[PDB]
Design an enzyme around this catalytic site. Structure first.
Site, PDB file in Angstrom:
ATOM      1  N   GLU A  39       1.924  -0.753  -4.976  1.00  0.00           N
ATOM      2  CA  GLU A  39       0.887   0.320  -5.582  1.00  0.00           C
ATOM      3  C   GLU A  39       1.530   1.384  -5.629  1.00  0.00           C
ATOM      4  O   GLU A  39       1.824   2.154  -4.345  1.00  0.00           O
ATOM      5  CB  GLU A  39      -0.293   0.190  -4.259  1.00  0.00           C
ATOM      6  CG  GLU A  39      -1.337   1.194  -5.023  1.00  0.00           C
ATOM      7  CD  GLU A  39      -1.971   2.059  -3.965  1.00  0.00           C
ATOM      8  OE1 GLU A  39      -1.611   2.140  -3.193  1.00  0.00           O
ATOM      9  OE2 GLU A  39      -3.427   2.543  -4.385  1.00  0.00           O
ATOM     10  N   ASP A  68       0.948  -1.164  -0.199  1.00  0.00           N
ATOM     11  CA  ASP A  68       0.105   0.130   0.049  1.00  0.00           C
ATOM     12  C   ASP A  68       0.831   1.236  -0.165  1.00  0.00           C
ATOM     13  O   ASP A  68       1.941   1.412   0.793  1.00  0.00           O
ATOM     14  CB  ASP A  68      -0.935  -0.133   1.345  1.00  0.00           C
ATOM     15  CG  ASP A  68      -1.941   1.024   1.283  1.00  0.00           C
ATOM     16  OD1 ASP A  68      -2.489   0.945   0.183  1.00  0.00           O
ATOM     17  OD2 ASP A  68      -1.914   1.717   2.409  1.00  0.00           O
TER      18      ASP A  68
HETATM   19  C1  LIG Z   1      -6.897   5.819  -2.279  1.00  0.00           C
HETATM   20  C2  LIG Z   1      -5.918   6.145  -3.211  1.00  0.00           C
HETATM   21  O1  LIG Z   1      -5.258   7.752  -3.130  1.00  0.00           O
HETATM   22  C3  LIG Z   1      -4.083   7.830  -3.988  1.00  0.00           C
HETATM   23  O2  LIG Z   1      -4.255   7.415  -5.271  1.00  0.00           O
HETATM   24  C4  LIG Z   1      -5.092   7.986  -6.221  1.00  0.00           C
HETATM   25  C5  LIG Z   1      -6.310   7.680  -6.246  1.00  0.00           C
HETATM   26  O3  LIG Z   1      -6.655   6.157  -6.112  1.00  0.00           O
HETATM   27  C6  LIG Z   1      -6.991   8.088  -7.546  1.00  0.00           C
HETATM   28  O4  LIG Z   1      -8.261   8.408  -7.577  1.00  0.00           O
HETATM   29  C7  LIG Z   1      -6.115   8.932  -8.547  1.00  0.00           C
HETATM   30  O5  LIG Z   1      -6.824   9.735  -9.304  1.00  0.00           O
HETATM   31  C8  LIG Z   1      -7.162   9.129 -10.573  1.00  0.00           C
HETATM   32  C9  LIG Z   1      -8.025   8.188 -10.871  1.00  0.00           C
HETATM   33  O6  LIG Z   1      -7.836   7.004 -10.292  1.00  0.00           O
HETATM   34  C10 LIG Z   1      -8.247   8.152 -12.542  1.00  0.00           C
HETATM   35  O7  LIG Z   1      -9.321   7.466 -12.886  1.00  0.00           O
HETATM   36  C11 LIG Z   1      -7.998   9.152 -13.361  1.00  0.00           C
HETATM   37  O8  LIG Z   1      -9.325  10.061 -13.292  1.00  0.00           O
HETATM   38  O9  LIG Z   1      -6.936  10.093 -12.945  1.00  0.00           O
HETATM   39  C12 LIG Z   1      -6.770  10.452 -11.720  1.00  0.00           C
HETATM   40  C13 LIG Z   1      -5.882  11.413 -11.481  1.00  0.00           C
HETATM   41  O10 LIG Z   1      -6.479  12.496 -10.345  1.00  0.00           O
HETATM   42  O11 LIG Z   1      -5.740  10.218  -7.425  1.00  0.00           O
HETATM   43  C14 LIG Z   1      -4.885   9.384  -6.333  1.00  0.00           C
HETATM   44  C15 LIG Z   1      -3.414   9.879  -6.828  1.00  0.00           C
HETATM   45  O12 LIG Z   1      -3.472  10.232  -7.892  1.00  0.00           O
HETATM   46  C16 LIG Z   1      -3.024   7.093  -3.323  1.00  0.00           C
HETATM   47  O13 LIG Z   1      -2.009   7.344  -3.836  1.00  0.00           O
HETATM   48  C17 LIG Z   1      -3.285   5.657  -3.170  1.00  0.00           C
HETATM   49  O14 LIG Z   1      -2.126   4.982  -2.429  1.00  0.00           O
HETATM   50  C18 LIG Z   1      -4.285   5.353  -2.487  1.00  0.00           C
HETATM   51  N1  LIG Z   1      -4.660   4.062  -2.459  1.00  0.00           N
HETATM   52  C19 LIG Z   1      -4.502   3.301  -1.154  1.00  0.00           C
HETATM   53  C20 LIG Z   1      -4.278   4.084  -0.110  1.00  0.00           C
HETATM   54  C21 LIG Z   1      -4.986   4.129   1.118  1.00  0.00           C
HETATM   55  C22 LIG Z   1      -4.615   4.389   2.575  1.00  0.00           C
HETATM   56  O15 LIG Z   1      -4.177   3.445   3.245  1.00  0.00           O
HETATM   57  C23 LIG Z   1      -6.361   3.277   0.962  1.00  0.00           C
HETATM   58  O16 LIG Z   1      -7.468   4.008   1.268  1.00  0.00           O
HETATM   59  C24 LIG Z   1      -6.681   2.679  -0.258  1.00  0.00           C
HETATM   60  O17 LIG Z   1      -7.799   1.702  -0.289  1.00  0.00           O
HETATM   61  C25 LIG Z   1      -5.371   2.073  -0.738  1.00  0.00           C
HETATM   62  O18 LIG Z   1      -5.709   1.091  -1.844  1.00  0.00           O
END
Ligand SMILES: C[C@H]1O[C@H](O[C@H]2[C@H](O)[C@@H](O)[C@@H](O[C@H]3[C@H](O)[C@@H](O)[C@@H](O)O[C@@H]3CO)O[C@@H]2CO)[C@H](O)[C@@H](O)[C@@H]1N[C@H]1C=C(CO)[C@@H](O)[C@H](O)[C@H]1O
Ligand SMILES: C[C@H]1O[C@H](O[C@H]2[C@H](O)[C@@H](O)[C@@H](O[C@H]3[C@H](O)[C@@H](O)[C@@H](O)O[C@@H]3CO)O[C@@H]2CO)[C@H](O)[C@@H](O)[C@@H]1N[C@H]1C=C(CO)[C@@H](O)[C@H](O)[C@H]1O
Lengths: 517, 522
Positions: free
Chosen positions: A262, A205
Site C-alpha cells: 500500500e 500497510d
Molecule cells: C488512511 C490512509 O491514509 C493515507 O492515505 C491517503 C488516504 O487514504 C486518501 O484519503 C488520500 O487522499 C486521496 C483520495 O483517496 C482520493 O480519492 C483523491 O481525492 O485524492 C486524495 C489526495 O488527497 O490521502 C492520503 C494520502 O494521500 C496513508 O498514506 C495510507 O497509508 C492510509 N491507509 C492505511 C493506514 C492506516 C494506519 O494504519 C489505516 O488507518 C488504513 O486503514 C490503512 O489502509
C-alpha cells in the site's frame, strides 16, 4: 494453475463481513460461513484486514500483540480453520502487515512510557524533547494523517510533562524507530510466525512508511493539504533494504510468499523502486482508484499503472479507506450503479491482478448519513466532525433480505457495531444471486469470462485514440470497449468483426462491452 | 419399584451431551449412545432441556414450534426411539415446558407482527402503545431478566415505529397473554401431544411466570438488582388455576404424570402454594443451591426445603443457569472438588429426589475464560459484555482422554478447554477414587440403605462447622471445617458405609461420611 500475476483477490473487512455469534462484530467463524460465497464468486485469494489483538482505536490498525488473534474475532484454532478451508476452496490467504506503528497498548510501548528519556525502551520508538522554554511545543511541525499534531506529550516519573512521541496516524499509534535493530528482529519473527500457519503473503500497510529522515526536519511547506508531500516523513532509501530482506525471507518458501504494498507517493520513479525484482511483488495502482468518471482520466491512469507496474499491476476501485464506487461515480443511485458496473467490467479486463472490496460486488453505496453518535473512525473525532471519515464503507454487509441484521447475524439490529440502514436488505447477496442481471451476477460472469478468454501474457493494444469519450483496446482475441459518453457507439469495421461476450448492461452509453474477435 | 418421591434425575443438556453425527452439536443419537451410562450411574429418570424447533437465541428456550424436534437434534421418530430405549432401561423421561414465552419465529408471533394494532393476532401476546409524546418510551419500567428493557418496539406496515411488545427474557422471546383463551388451549394440546408419546412428565420453565398483573404497573422499586422483587411481573394468583388445570389432566393417566416447577420467588411461604395437593408435585429447592459452603447456612436451607417440600423436596446443587459446584465452592480446583464431593454426598442422603446436572458427576469446573467471539448466551450481548452469562457450564462433555473433542464428537458449538481431557468420563470410570466413581457408589448405597421413608432426625450439637443427622440406622456427618472432627460417643457406635474422601472414626476436613448404627461392633 494459480498465478499471483493474474489473481483476483477478495478483501475481507472481517469486522463487517459475517457475525457468527450475534454480538454485532464480524468474526472468523462468520468468515468460515462465507468462504463458499467468495469462492463461488470466482475469486482466487482473500486479503484479511488486521485481526490481531487490538483495542480498535483504528479498528485493527493499532495492534497490541502481533502474534495473537483478537478475542472478539476468534481463536488461533478458528484462524487455522479459515486458512485450511480457504485453501481447500482454492483460495490463497494474505494477511495485513502493520509495521509502521503499533498500539500504545503494546507491551513495548507501555515499557517505553515507564522508562526514562534516552532509555533503550524509548529508543525503539521516536521520543524527542519538546521545543519552547518549557518543552511545550512539539519537536517539529508534522501533521498526523488523521488531523492535528503528529506528536503527543507524555508524563514523566516525577509527574511533570516531558518528552513527546511521534505518531503518523492516531495518538494511540506510536511509530517505531526502524533504525533500532530490535524492530526488524521482531517483524521477521512476525512474518515467520504467520507463514508457518500457511499464510501465503502480506499486504503491507503504509509501505511508504517505516523509515523517516534521520533529522526529522520540519516540513518546509507548512501544515495541511496545501503543504504538499512531506518528503522527510515518508519514502526513505532505507525502506528498500527492508523490503529486500522481507523478499529474501519470503522467497525461502515453496511456493514463494507474496508481498503487495500500500504505497502513496507522488512520484512514479519513487514508486517503481519498491517494485524492483528483489523487493515487492506489486503495489496497488491507486491512480485509477482516485479518478472521476472520465474516459481521458481513466485511460491516463491505466497507462500510468501499466508503465510503472512492469505490465501486471494490482488494480483496485475501492477499499476500506475510500468511498464506495457507486457513490464516487454518482457525482444518484441509478447513475452510480451503471458506472460502477461499467468500471468493474473495465478493470477486470486489465492485465494483472484485481482487488475487490467486500460489498462492491453488491453495488453498495456509501452510507453518508450515519448519526453523529454512531461514528467510530478516529478521523471523525480528530477533525471535530469536519471530516466524515470511513465508517460509511464499513457497514456490516447484507446477506439476506429477511432478518433484523439482513443475515449478517441472527441477532437484533442494535447489536451491529455500526448500524445498517433500513434499506440495506435491498442489496442482499441472496437476492442478487438469484438475479442474472444483478451486480453480483455481473461479477460472477466477469470472473468466469476473464478466466476463460483472457491470459496474463496478453498485453493491452490500444484501439481508441487518446482523448476520446470511448476507450477501446485489444488483448489477444478479445476487444474491450467502455463508452464513457452519452452517445451510442458503433465500433469501426477496421477493428475486425466482433461477437459479444458480455456487457455491463453498438456499445450503449456508460457501458462496457467485451467482444470476441 | 420406581417412585418420584426419591427419583434421581439426570439433567440432559442435549446440545452439550454427545454428538453422534459430527457437526459439533449434541443430538438425540448421542443421547441414545449414552443412555446406558446414565442408567449404569444409578439414575432413575432423565430431564431433557428443550429440544423443540428453535433458532437457539436462548438455546432452546425460544421455541418456534412446540410439536416438533429441532432438525439439528433429530426427528420425531428418533425421539420416539430414545423414549423407548430410556423406558427399557427403567428411566422415566421429563420434557421441558416453556409456556411463558415463545420464539419470535413462532407462526403466532410472525402473524402478530404482520397484523395491525388491536388485532386478535396481537391479543395473544402483550402489545402496548409506548409512552412519551411520540411513543418513544417503553410502556412501563420493567427490566428484562437478561438485561435492558423488557419491551421492544416494532415497525408498523406504514413504516412508522409503533407498538411495543413485552418480553421477560430476550427480545426474541415475546411473552404470551395468558388471559387470551387460545394460549391455554395451545398448551393443553402440547401436554397431550407429548404425553401420547410416552413422556412421563414436565419440568416447568419459569413456573412463577405466565400471568402478570393485568394493569402491568410500573415497578415502584426502580430497575436493576437492588429494585427488589417486581410483584406485578410474576407470581400472580391466576397461575395456580393454570397448574390445577395441568395437574387435573396429568392425574388421568396411569401412572399419573409428573410436574416439577422451576420457581424463583422471594419467600419460601410463596413457594408452598405451588405445591398444594392439586398443583405441582414438586419444585427445585433453590435455597440450598444458593448457599455458600457453610454448615449453618446449609442446615437452615435443608430445614426450609423439608418444610416446603412436605418432607420430600427436589434437591439440586447445579443446573444449566448457574456456575458449576466445583467453581462455586472453590472460587482453586482442589478445594472446590473436595467440597463438591462432600456436598454431593450430603445432598444424596436427604429425603426426597435429586437432580444431577450433566457433568457435575465428573466434577467439572465452570469454564470462565471464553473468548468474546465464543460467547452465545444473550446475557452477554444484552449486558454489553458486563455479565459473563451461562456458556461456561454448557461446554460439551469430555468422554475420552483422547480425541480433538475428547470423544464428544468424532468445531464444537462451544469450545472445550485443552484441560477438559483430564476430566474424561472413561478415565474416571477406571479410577475408584474419581468423582464419577463417588457418584456411582453414592447412588448404589442410597438405593440399598436409604430406600425407605425414614425422615431426618437431627443429632445433638457438637460445634459450629459440623452438620449431622440420622435416617433410621444411617448416620450422616458432614464436616464443613478445616479441622478433623471426632463424633461424640452419644451418637452411638458408627460403622462406615462410604465417605466423600478415601480408616479412623474421625471425619476428615471438608468431608461427608455415611455410617450405620447397630452393626454389632465396638
Ligand atoms: C488512511 C490512509 O491514509 C493515507 O492515505 C491517503 C488516504 O487514504 C486518501 O484519503 C488520500 O487522499 C486521496 C483520495 O483517496 C482520493 O480519492 C483523491 O481525492 O485524492 C486524495 C489526495 O488527497 O490521502 C492520503 C494520502 O494521500 C496513508 O498514506 C495510507 O497509508 C492510509 N491507509 C492505511 C493506514 C492506516 C494506519 O494504519 C489505516 O488507518 C488504513 O486503514 C490503512 O489502509
Ligand atoms: C435464567 C433464569 O433467570 C431467572 O432466575 C435468575 C434470577 O432472576 C437471578 O436473580 C439469579 O438469582 C440469583 C440471586 O439473584 C442471588 O441473590 C442468589 O440467590 O443466587 C441466585 C441464583 O444464582 O439467577 C436466577 C437463575 O439464573 C428466572 O427466574 C428463571 O426462570 C430463569 N431460568 C429459566 C428461564 C429461561 C427463559 O426461558 C431460560 O433462559 C433458562 O435456561 C431457564 O432455566
Amino acid at each position: 494453475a494459480f498465478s499471483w500475476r493474474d489473481a483476483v483477490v477478495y478483501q475481507v473487512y472481517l469486522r463487517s463481513f459475517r457475525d457468527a455469534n450475534g454480538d454485532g462484530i464480524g468474526d472468523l467463524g462468520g468468515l468460515s460461513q462465507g468462504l463458499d460465497a467468495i469462492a463461488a464468486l470466482g475469486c482466487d485469494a482473500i486479503w484479511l484486514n488486521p485481526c490481531y489483538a487490538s483495542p480498535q482505536r483504528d479498528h485493527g490498525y493499532d495492534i497490541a500483540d502481533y502474534l495473537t488473534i483478537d478475542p472478539a474475532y476468534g481463536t488461533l484454532e478458528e484462524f487455522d480453520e479459515v486458512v485450511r478451508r480457504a485453501h481447500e476452496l482454492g483460495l490463497r490467504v494474505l494477511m495485513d502487515m502493520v509495521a509502521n506503528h503499533c498500539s500504545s497498548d503494546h507491551a513495548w510501548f507501555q515499557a517505553a512510557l515507564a522508562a526514562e528519556p534516552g532509555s533503550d525502551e524509548r529508543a525503539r520508538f521516536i521520543f524527542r524533547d519538546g521545543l519552547g522554554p518549557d518543552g511545550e511545543l512539539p519537536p517539529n511541525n508534522w501533521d498526523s494523517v488523521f488531523g492535528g499534531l503528529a506528536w503527543t506529550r507524555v508524563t514523566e516519573r516525577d509527574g511533570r510533562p516531558g518528552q513527546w512521541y511521534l505518531h503518523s496516524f492516531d495518538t494511540s499509534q506510536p511509530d517505531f524507530d526502524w533504525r533500532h535493530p530490535a524492530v526488524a528482529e521482531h517483524f521477521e519473527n512476525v512474518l515467520r510466525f504467520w507463514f508457518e500457519r500457511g499464510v501465503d503473503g502480506f499486504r503491507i500497510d503504509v509501505a511508504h512508511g517505516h523509515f523517516k529522515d534521520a533529522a526529522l526536519p520540519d516540513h518546509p511547506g507548512g501544515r495541511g493539504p496545501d503543504a504538499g508531500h512531506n518528503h522527510g516523513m515518508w519514502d526513505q532509501p532505507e525502506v528498500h533494504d527492508l523490503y529486500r530482506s522481507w523478499r529474501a525471507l519470503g522467497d525461502a518458501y515453496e511456493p514463494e510468499k507474496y508481498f503487495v504494498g500500500e504505497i502513496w507517493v507522488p512520484s512514479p520513479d519513487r514508486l517503481a523502486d519498491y517494485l524492483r525484482p528483489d523487493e515487492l511483488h506489486n503495489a496497488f495502482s491507486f491512480d485509477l482508484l482516485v479518478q472521476p468518471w472520465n474516459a481521458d482520466r481513466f485511460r491516463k491512469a491505466i497507462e500510468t499503472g501499466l508503465a510503472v507496474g512492469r505490465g501486471w499491476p494490482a488494480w483496485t476501485l475501492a477499499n476500506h479507506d475510500v468511498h464506495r464506487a457507486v457513490t464516487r461515480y454518482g457525482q444518484d443511485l441509478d447513475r452510480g450503479l451503471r458506472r460502477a458496473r461499467a468500471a468493474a467490467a473495465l478493470a477486470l479486463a486489465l492485465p494483472g491482478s484485481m482487488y475487490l472490496y467486500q460489498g462492491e460486488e453488491l453495488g453498495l453505496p456509501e452510507v453518508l448519513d450515519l448519526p453523529d453518535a454512531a461514528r467510530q473512525d478516529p478521523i471523525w473525532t480528530r477533525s471535530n466532525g469536519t471530516e466524515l471519515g470511513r465508517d460509511g464503507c464499513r457497514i456490516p454487509l447484507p446477506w439476506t433480505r429477511e432478518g433484523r441484521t439482513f443475515g449478517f447475524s441472527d441477532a437484533a439490529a442494535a447489536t451491529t457495531w455500526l448500524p445498517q440502514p433500513a434499506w440495506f436488505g435491498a442489496f442482499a447477496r441472496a437476492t442478487q444471486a438469484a438475479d442474472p442481471d444483478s451486480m453480483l451476477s455481473l461479477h460472477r460472469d466477469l470472473l468466469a469470462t476473464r478466466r476463460t478468454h483472457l491470459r496474463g501474457t496478453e498485453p493491452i493494444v490500444w484501439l481508441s485514440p487518446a482523448g476520446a469519450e470511448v476507450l477501446a483496446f485489444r488483448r489477444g482475441d478479445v476487444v474491450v470497449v467502455t463508452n464513457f459518453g452519452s452517445a451510442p457507439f458503433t465500433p469501426p469495421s477496421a477493428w475486425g468483426a466482433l461477437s459479444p461476450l458480455l456487457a455491463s448492461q453498438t456499445v450503449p452509453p456508460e457501458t462496457t462491452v467485451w467482444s470476441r474477435l
